[PDB]
Symmetry: C3
Subunit: 249 residues, 3 copies
């Protein structure tokens, strides 16, 4: 609602979901929560079969995980929040909708939780709009399921390098490694996303959905079957006094 | 008659030419002719490599014969699918060197045949597009064919290619990696002979053990649940929407 | 030493230079020196990255030492293979940043070493070919090495590379992805230093945990079946047809130089 602007075109069967959590679309719990609710409503609305995800304001697609949500909070809150992080990944990655990311800003690790779970990724050709899983730069590591998603996007070798170096690929490099599908002038990102979704939405819907599910079920299952353990892993880590301290920078 | 096997002079390599006009559709009869012909060549110690190609250029294979899948009884659907599986299993695990000289369009089931080979050469004609276009008809590739594609072009590219049901023209096919070479159409056959010579020069047992190490896990995923896959095929293809699309198409 | 270590503790990097002439063959002796040298650098808190290269350009490593595998006792073959496995395990799971400065030809066992590194730079000399050429010797790559190759270049390319036993010259090596950069010969060492400067700058533990996340499944496949894999090597290499293939190849090798 507040933090997610939905612009629907029911006649076309398309909606645009614009992120509106300034200054940087950080993944706060309200934002994570609002994103999933909004996606779910578009899923259950049979009028809508494709969604374009983008920032309302260009510059930052999403800054990623939000520090306020993870600093000096309750054990309860941490569990609710990593559960909400997982939920967003799961619901995006398994959505029956066609999902296209119109990446009109920088896209570090948590922004990649969103971009990598879409069906197609278009990046604006702005040298500031770098994309990748940069966890190691901050002294942390990608969740296994996010690593898996990246491996599913760019292959094992490139994921090994990208994750260890915590690379944020500038647009030409991002295209070359395959983390995005197209790079276009910034003024053409939304038109390119429209052209892309027209093509994807034209596929017979059930067959497309079944095909998508066959491709992604093993990866999604790995998180569904270990989900509580994965929350506990997060909680134990960030509940540490010493990690809490290091959040302090 | 549906499959011509032309031994090269000096043996070693044979050319298998598809001849089930008009589009080399994989009828049940053609499927079993391909399997027997391949087995003969395997068992003949004079032959260790085969080039697969159409007798007439234009269409490599249109794929599955939709008439085997539209008017028919549940048992017919099941026996047909068992034969489709058999062809994939036997090609994919063949001890022969298999090279495709792709001298025509190569949609879904044709692309199956191609993807099971060790090397794929595509004639440079803009009509000769290759891919797994099942979703165009509202159908999906079976898991083992999806795995064969992923094993060819990687996960991301397969995710896109299968969902969009894409047929790649030659330059795009080469870029995505679904074929290994693109050459002028009047050179496809000679190029295949040159390319298979590289493979024929490998110590034969070592080559075969290596091929098996690369492919056995993928094949075994189907071997372990082959009857399940037949019943899933029969249930899926028997749905009324699917039947209507095939009949319309036919 | 057959392994020359040149340290730069202030920069946190050491260069490990192979010096087992004439072609840095992986004898049992040399294998164990490499394992120990790597463990000493791991344990030394001053070092976090290592560049592997040949002291003498021309051959990075000729790979496994055929004289260890030809006409020897079954226990010799087993002990040899346990050491080969040990080198792969230690390299592949090293907590160090490992960069190969590939300054020579790099056939199968050499490629074992290169593929276990985090980054591979190949000198642009048309004779400096890299690949898993086991099938040209009438043998095959072990499953774990096949997995390492697939983890480097993907399934399709591994299929072709392994069956054909390809030794990729530099341009083809870069195109297939088996190395990460191809540079003029006189830049291979400087490129490796530039590369490793960047890798060593990453928060160390996070890098290590990430590397483990990417590699533990592959390594575990050998660890859990390790003595079976020794048994399989001995049984396979002992076949008379394989002994024959290996002694013919050895004989061919000797003839091509003397
Ligand atoms: C189931 C699992 C199975 C097994 C997995 C095995 C993995 C493997 O490593 S297999 C071996 C792969 N290695 C090779 O193919 C390299 C063989 N060597 C060569 O082609 C060349 O020697 C090469 C590349 C070093 C070029 O150097 P160059 O100086 O031009 O040639 P070369 O004349 O051979 O070198 C000189 C000496 O090194 C020896 N040599 C070279 N390679 C080897 C080797 N792999 N083993 C032992 N000796 C070797 C030569 O025989 C010769 O001396 P000598 O006959 O007295 O031992």
């Amino acid at each position: 609602s507040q933090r997610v602007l939905v612009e629907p075109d029911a006649g076309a069967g398309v909606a645009v979901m614009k992120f509106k959590n300034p200054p940087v679309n950080s993944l706060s719990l309200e934002f994570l929560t609002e994103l999933v609710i909004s996606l779910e409503k578009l899923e259950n609305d049979k009028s809508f079969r494709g969604v374009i995800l983008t920032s309302d304001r260009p510059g930052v697609f999403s800054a990623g995980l939000d520090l306020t949500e993870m600093c000096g909070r309750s054990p309860a809150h941490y569990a609710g929040y990593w559960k909400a992080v997982q939920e967003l990944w799961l619901r995006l990655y398994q959505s029956n909708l066609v999902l296209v990311s119109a990446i009109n800003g920088a896209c570090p690790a948590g922004g990649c939780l969103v971009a990598l779970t879409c069906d197609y990724r278009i990046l604006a050709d702005n040298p500031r709009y770098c994309i990748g899983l940069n966890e190691t730069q901050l002294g942390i590591i990608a969740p296994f399921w996010l690593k898996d998603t990246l491996e599913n996007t760019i292959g094992h070798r490139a994921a090994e390098r990208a994750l260890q170096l915590g690379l944020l690929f500038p647009p030409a490099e991002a295209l070359q490694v395959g983390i995005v599908d197209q790079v276009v002038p910034e003024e053409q990102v939304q038109s390119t996303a429209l052209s892309a979704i027209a093509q994807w939405m034209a596929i017979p819907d059930h067959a497309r959905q079944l095909t998508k599910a066959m491709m992604r079920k093993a990866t999604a299952s790995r998180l569904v079957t270990q989900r509580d353990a994965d929350v506990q892993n997060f909680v134990s880590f960030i509940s540490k006094d010493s990690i809490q301290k290091s959040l302090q920078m």
